[PDB]
Amino acid sequence: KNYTFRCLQMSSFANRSWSRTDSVVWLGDLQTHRWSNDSATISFTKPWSQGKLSNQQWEKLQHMFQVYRVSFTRDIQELVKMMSPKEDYPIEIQLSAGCEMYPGNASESFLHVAFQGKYVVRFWGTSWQTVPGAPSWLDLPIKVLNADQGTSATVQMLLNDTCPLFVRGLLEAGKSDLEKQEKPVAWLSSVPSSAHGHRQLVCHVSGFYPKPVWVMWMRGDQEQQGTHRGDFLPNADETWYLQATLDVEAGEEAGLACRVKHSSLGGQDIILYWGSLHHILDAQKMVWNHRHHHHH
Amino acid sequence: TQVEQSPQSLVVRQGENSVLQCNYSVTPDNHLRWFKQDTGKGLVSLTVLVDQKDKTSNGRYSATLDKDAKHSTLHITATLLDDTATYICVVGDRGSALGRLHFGAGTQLIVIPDIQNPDPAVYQLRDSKSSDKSVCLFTDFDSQTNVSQSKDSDVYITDKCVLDMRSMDFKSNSAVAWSNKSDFACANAFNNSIIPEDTFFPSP
Amino acid sequence: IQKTPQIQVYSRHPPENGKPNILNCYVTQFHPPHIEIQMLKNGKKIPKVEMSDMSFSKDWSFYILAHTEFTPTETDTYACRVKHASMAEPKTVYWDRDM
Amino acid sequence: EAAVTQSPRNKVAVTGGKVTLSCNQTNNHNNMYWYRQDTGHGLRLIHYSYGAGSTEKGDIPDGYKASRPSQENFSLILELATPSQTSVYFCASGDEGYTQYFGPGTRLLVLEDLKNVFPPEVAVFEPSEAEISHTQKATLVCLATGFYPDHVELSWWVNGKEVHSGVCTDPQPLKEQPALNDSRYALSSRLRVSATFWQNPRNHFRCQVQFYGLSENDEWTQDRAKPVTQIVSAEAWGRAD
Ligand SMILES: CCCCCCCCCCCCCC[C@@H](O)CC(=O)N[C@@H](CO[C@H]1O[C@H](CO)[C@H](O)[C@H](O)[C@H]1O)[C@H](O)CCCCCCCCCCCC(C)C
Ligand SMILES: *[C@@H]1O[C@H](CO)[C@@H](O[C@@H]2O[C@H](CO)[C@@H](O[C@@H]3O[C@H](CO)[C@@H](O)[C@H](O)[C@@H]3O)[C@H](O)[C@H]2NC(C)=O)[C@H](O)[C@H]1NC(C)=O
Ligand SMILES: *[C@@H]1O[C@H](CO)[C@@H](O[C@@H]2O[C@H](CO)[C@@H](O)[C@H](O)[C@H]2NC(C)=O)[C@H](O)[C@H]1NC(C)=O
Ligand SMILES: *[C@@H]1O[C@H](CO)[C@@H](O[C@@H]2O[C@H](CO)[C@@H](O)[C@H](O)[C@H]2NC(C)=O)[C@H](O)[C@H]1NC(C)=O
Ligand SMILES: CCCCCCC
């Protein structure tokens, strides 16, 4: 029920002259906006990406962000001229700002900055501040940024008021896609394990939405505790993929099943039995010469 | 040019009010500052405007800023003679040292005193040394009168300056003319200018 | 500062030989964000290859998803070739349907 | 109050020469800036610095080098002086905030050579009898003529003490040959006193012009006199007649 809204900025500076800034916006695991360096305007990746804001209210925010993009670029190049030669090109700056929606009329905002891959600065209260363990040569650039009372005032406004106000409406406009249910599809395969005389059983689960899922190898009522749950891998159509593997001794596969529990299945779990007729036919349809197989 | 100041030049009578304008296209525009530059001196800050629609005062100086029209106005009320200078409009593009200043070319302000009783006259002054050299002094004419330059290669004409004989609370305008030439008569030295009908031309 | 990319090659639907599908190449955990990703069929480059917008996780590590329409067969070899500053040579990762 | 000093207040150089303009600041300001002022333009940024050892190019850096040896000093170096560098140079300093504190300015004249450098000739013209009887005021005119470059200070000295009361000297000098780039100049001044003051034979009036030409530091060799930095004066005595 808790949704985190994230504005991610990626800025690359190769030398004094060359630079590019690309941004993406997320509401939970759904991309809502895109702003390529090449593009003059913020793009909607959803039909409800404008939220409850008006075309007038939206253009006011878009102009502010257009001015910011231009300014940020020149301001980074200047703060580099201040740190010279303690910091030099190429420079990578990342920025993550947003708010996460809590139950009731409650929400906390954040603005984190990472420099050359490492988290270094945040906006907290009314100022920019370095994080503990941040390098000493960042104190003077943070002092010059804190001198700019105008930027500080608008950042406070965006974090305290604008972000929650906008996201409350964004949840309204996008409710149909956030609570969208896509059913998973599971299939089986096996590879040799790293250990001699062992096999690794693979249960593939793809195309489910939302992300929470339960995948377990079973033997009747007994959950195999060797089940290794893989990471969530994304699909191109906003669904998820997950693998769950199980190391077994060659010949122990018969009796094993892969159970999948998901909200979209309405209590009707997917139970995939290893040596069943469905599996045999599925396995015969995905045979190959094994050329360039991994090292399993 | 991203900062344009109007007018380029402005002549005001002493005690009268002055209006100086600044239009700019600088983006972003954090603040606008007005400077006074006394001739041959440096810039002295009169005032700074920072808000979207701002107003500011500092004695006889007052200024407005409209960030939507990108326009500032400087007002000088009851202009004194010491207000003769160049007034420069500066736009700051950041609220810190990361910013750049964008400077207007300035407005040259000339404050001219009244001269309660003009007594225009052209006098010939001879050198203290036994040289037979001389100068022509056009003096005591009204502050409105403009002294035109020499339309002749061998004749030199200076512009008008007002001197204060403070002890007698008396101000007077004067312009000098001279020539290397033989046939140089003072009675016609300043004829390229608008000479008052009442001008005294003593005979040599 | 410099990190090597992790490459994951997997299909959208259950693989059935001779049946059209989508091949995904998920490239993750790299730094800097400049990367070249190309998808290959029998050692040759596939032309119509789509890429998601570059993004990053809560731990600041970058990721991007490359995908393309393919048709698995018993003989056609599919791979994802990644050229990044962190590697001396491009890393080619073959699609292994059983893995 | 925050302040900045510049040296020299005026400088004369020749084409191909080397000029150094210095800036001193004791406000403990990290940031320092160099501008040039030209007619028809606003101040233009040449170079700037974010601290000791740092020098960054501005908008018009071509033909200029900069050096920030310490916090307090910032210099502008012209290794190869060109006449297009003739301008007024302003130095400024600041902290992390947006205000810059400007120095008083340096005037730099870049010449083709020094052959054309001349000291002013000075004359005092005596009040006319017609002004005396008509106004009961007496105006003395001082003419400083034939000087190049424009590097002079004209002041009036009555009975041994310099006066500033009743004086108006021309703001700008006159070109003696307007249609000529290296033209010699003329400048006038007037001192207006009472008729009774001029008519006092004990009253001694002296116009003083101090020229800044050349020294032993400048190489000069011509058949005419060296235009050495000198004091030129003209003087008149008041008279009963
Ligand atoms: C939806 C898709 C959107 C893409 C997602 C983007 C991610 C979200 C970013 C949120 C920040 C935006 C709020 C700021 C604006 O709201 C004001 C503005 O434009 N400021 C600029 C102009 O400032 C000038 O213009 C301003 C006009 O408002 C004022 O006049 C101001 O006083 C003046 O100085 C300001 O310098 C730019 C400086 C940026 C400050 C951030 C620096 C990073 C901090 C880390 C330090 C770096 C360290 C590693 C070395
Ligand atoms: C936006 O929200 C933040 C909170 O997330 C507000 O920050 C708080 O701002 C006040 C001042 O405006 C800070 O109070 C100060 O506390 C110090 C002692 O720590 C005291 O010396 C000062 O006199 C003052 O009372 C407060 O600390 C700060 N909170 C945090 C977490 O730093 C911010 O003001 C809000 N801005 C707007 C414009 O709504
Ligand atoms: C600054 O960095 C950019 C990016 O690294 C340089 O541009 C690249 O130059 C190489 C030269 O072989 C090209 O192959 C790339 O395609 C260029 N990229 C782009 C987008 O232009 C640039 O040359 C560098 N500039 C300086 C002054 O060193
Ligand atoms: C990233 O975006 C900026 C802004 O669009 C690019 O810089 C501009 O490029 C155009 C065309 O080359 C110039 O006319 C502008 O003067 C540039 N500056 C600005 C601030 O607009 C920049 O080239 C882009 N970089 C890359 C690598 O695509
Ligand atoms: C997409 C704009 C949302 C406004 C909140 C900025 C942190």
Ligand 5 center from residue A163 Cα (angstroms): 5
CB proximity list for B57: less than 8 A, separation 6 or greater: B47, B63
- Residue with CA nearest ligand 3 atom 19: A18
D129 sits in which H/E element: helix D129-135
Q: Which domain does B176 fall in, by range? A: 114-204
Do B92 and B142 fall within a single domain? no
- Tell me the shortest Cα–Cα distance from B66 to chain A, in angstroms: 16
Residue C96 is classified by DSSP as -
**Among D10, D226, D203, which residue's Cα sits nearest to residue D106?**
D10
Degrees (nearest 5) of the Cα angle B93, B99, B103? 60
Q: How far is residue B125 from each of residues A167, A176, D88, D155, D169, measured CA to CA in Å?
A: 87, 99, 37, 19, 17
Boundaries of every domain in chain A: 1-179, 180-276
Please say whether the dihedral angle defined by the alpha carbons of residues A15, A16, A17 and A23, taken in this order, is positive or negative. positive
Q: Peptide bond preceding B28: is omega within 30 degrees of 0, i.e. cis?
A: yes
CB D108 within 8 Å of CB D138: no
Neighbour-count burial for D39-50, b at 16+ CB within 10 Å, e otherwise: eeebbebbbbbb
CB spacing of D98 vs A147 below 8 angstroms: yes
Is A275 annotated for ligand binding? no
What does DSSP say about strands D56-57 and D106-111: parallel, antiparallel, or unpaired?
unpaired
Q: Using DSSP, state whether D1 is helix, strand or coil.
A: coil
CB A25 within 8 A of CB A6: yes
8 Å CB contact between A30 and A174: yes
Taking the CA of A17 as reference, the closest ligand is: 3
Name the residue of A15, A36, A37, A88 to mutate for ligand 3: max ligand atoms within 8 A of Cβ. Answer: A15
Residues of A with Cβ-Cβ distance to B25 under 8 angstroms? none
Indicate the length of chain A as a whole number: 296
In angstroms, the CA D7 to CA A148 distance is: 33
CB C91 within 8 A of CB C81: yes
* Residues 6 or more apart whose Cβ sits within 8 Å of residue A113: A93, A94, A95, A96, A119, A120, A121, A122
Q: How far is the CA of C87 from the centre of ligand 1 (A)?
A: 35
Question: How far is residue D173's CA from residue A18's CA, in Å, rounded to a whole number?
Answer: 50
CA distance D143 to C98: 104
Which two three-digit tokens encode residue D130?
A: 């017609």
Q: Report the SS3 class of residue B120.
A: coil
Both B34 and B75 in a single domain? Answer: yes
Residue whose token pair is 């964004």 = A170
Rounded to whole angstroms, the Cα distance separating A183 from A189 reads 20
From C7's Cα to the closest Cα of chain A, the distance in A is: 11
The domain boundary, picked from B69, B96, B113, lies at B113
DSSP state of D222: -
Q: Which domain holds residue D202?
A: 113-241
| Other chains touching A, judged by 3 or more CB pairs under 8 Å | B, C, D
Q: Rounded to a whole number, what is the largest CA-CA distance in chain A?
A: 72
Instruction: Give the gap in angstroms from C-alpha B41 to the nearest C-alpha of chain A.
Output: 30
Please state, in angstroms and rounded to a whole number, the distance separating the CA atoms of residues D203 and D238: 5
> Do B108 and B70 fall within a single domain?
yes
Bridge partners, residue B49, by sequence: B32
Q: Checking DSSP bridges between strand A198-208 and strand B31-37, what pairing results, if any? A: unpaired
Indicate which ligand has the atom closest to the C-alpha of A40. 4
* Residues in B touching A70 (Cβ below 8 Å): 27
CB distance A191 to C99 below 8 Å: yes
Q: Enter the tokens of residue C80.
A: 């994802």
CA pair distance B164, D163, nearest whole angstrom = 12
For chain B, the domain total comes to 2
Classify strands D10-14 and D106-111 as parallel, antiparallel or unpaired. parallel
Nearest in space to A29 (alpha carbons), one of A169, A215, A232, A214: A232
Asked if residue D206 and residue D140 are part of one domain, the reply reads yes
Q: Which residues lie across from A108 on neighbouring strands? A: A100
Residue of chain A whose alpha carbon sits nearest to that of C64: A234
User: Both tokens of residue B69?
Assistant: 């029209």
- Going by their DSSP bridges, the two strands B53-58 and B61-66 should be labelled as antiparallel
Exposure letters A89-107 (e unless 16+ CB within 10 A, then b): eebbbbbbbbbbbeeeeeb
Spatial contact of A244 and A230, defined as CB atoms under 8 Å apart: yes
Domain boundary pick from D112, D141, D169: D112
Distance CA A195, CA A199 (A): 8
Residues in chain B within 8 Å Cβ distance of A60: none
Burial class (CB in 10 A: 0-12, 13-18, 19+), A227: middle
Q: Whose CA is nearest to atom 3 of ligand 5?
A: A163
Shared domain check, D130 and D213: yes
Rounded CA-CA distance C29/A33 in Å is: 22
Burial of A241 (0-12, 13-18, 19+ CB in 10 A): buried
Token reading at B121: 């006259």
Instruction: Give the type of residue at B171.
Output: K
B125 CB burial (10 A radius; 0-12, 13-18, 19+): buried
Q: What is the C-alpha separation between A256 and A201, in angstroms, rounded?
A: 10
**Tokens matching residue B191:** 């004829």
CA-based nearest residue to B5, from D88, D59, D41, D102: D41
Interface C:D, ≥3 CB–CB pairs < 8 Å: no
Of D83, D78, D79, D75, residue with least CA distance to D32: D75
CA distances from A131 to A83, A138, A182, D51, D155 (A): 18, 10, 41, 25, 64
By what technique were these coordinates determined? X-ray
H helix or E strand, kind and range, residue B175: strand B171-179
* Whole-angstrom distance, CA of residue B24 vs CA of residue B1: 9
Query: Are residues B2 and B94 both part of a single domain?
Result: yes
Going by the DSSP 8-state scheme, the letter that residue B149 receives in this structure is: P
Written as one string, the DSSP assignment of chain A is: --EEEEEEEEEEE-SSS-EEEEEEEEETTEEEEEE-TT-SS-EESSTTTTTT--HHHHHHHHHHHHHHHHHHHHHHHHHHHHHTTSS-SSEEEEEEEEEEEETTTEEEEEEEEEETTEEEEEEETTEEEEPTT--GGGHHHHHHHHH-HHHHHHHHHIIIIIHHHHHHHHHHHTHHHHT--B--EEEEEEEE-SSTTEEEEEEEEEEEBSS--EEEEEETTEE-TTPEE---EE-TTS-EEEEEEEEEETT--TT-EEEEE-GGGTT--EEEETTSHHHHHHHHTT----TT----
Closest CA to D111 of D213, D211, D13: D13
Give CA–CA dist A175/B22, Å, rounded. 51
Quote the CA–CA distance of A247 and A195 in Å, as a whole number. 9
Q: CA angle, B91 as apex, D92 and B30 as ends, to 5°?
A: 105
End-to-end CA distance of chain A: 40
Most informative mutation of A12, A18, A38, A67 for ligand 4 (most atoms within 8 A of CB): A38
- How many whole angstroms separate alpha carbon D47 and alpha carbon D54? 10
Assess whether the C-beta atom of A181 lies below 6 angstroms from ligand 3. no
Last residue of a domain, one of D112, D137, D158: D112
Angle at A136 between CA A130 and CA A140, to 5 degrees: 75
Is A32 marked as a binding-site residue? no
Name the helix (H) or strand (E) containing C68. Answer: strand C62-70
3-class secondary-structure state, position D236? strand
User: Is A174 within 8 Å of A27 (Cβ atoms)?
Assistant: yes
**How far is the C-alpha of B22 from the C-alpha of B65, rounded, in Å?**
9
Q: Do residue D235 and residue B43 have CB atoms under 8 angstroms apart?
A: no
Chains linked to B by 3 or more Cβ pairs within 8 Å: A, D
B28 sits in the region (left: phi over 0; alpha: psi -120 to 50; else beta) called: beta
Q: How many domains does chain C have?
A: 1
Nominal resolution in Å? Answer: 2.4
Using CB atoms, pick whichever of A81, A143, A146 lies closest to residue D56. Answer: A81
D110-122: buried (b, 16+ CB within 10 Å) or exposed (e) per residue? bbeebeebbbbeb
**In this structure, are B49 and B70 located in the same domain?**
yes
Same domain, B55 and B118: no
How far is Cα B23 from Cα B91, in angstroms, rounded to an integer?
A: 10
Report which of B41, B80, B75 is spatially closest to residue B56, judged by C-alpha positions: B75
Query: Residue D130 has what DSSP assignment?
Result: H
Distance, in Å, from the CA atom of D184 to the CA atom of D180, rounded to the nearest integer, reads 9
Please list the residues that pair with D109 across neighbouring strands: D12
Round to whole Å and give the CA distance between A137 and A120: 11
Q: Name the residue with tokens 């009747």.
A: A220
Distance CA(D155)–CA(A186), nearest Å, equals 102
Å from CA of D74 to ligand 2 middle? 40
Show the tokens assigned to B36: 């006074």
> Which residue carries 């962190």 as its tokens?
C86
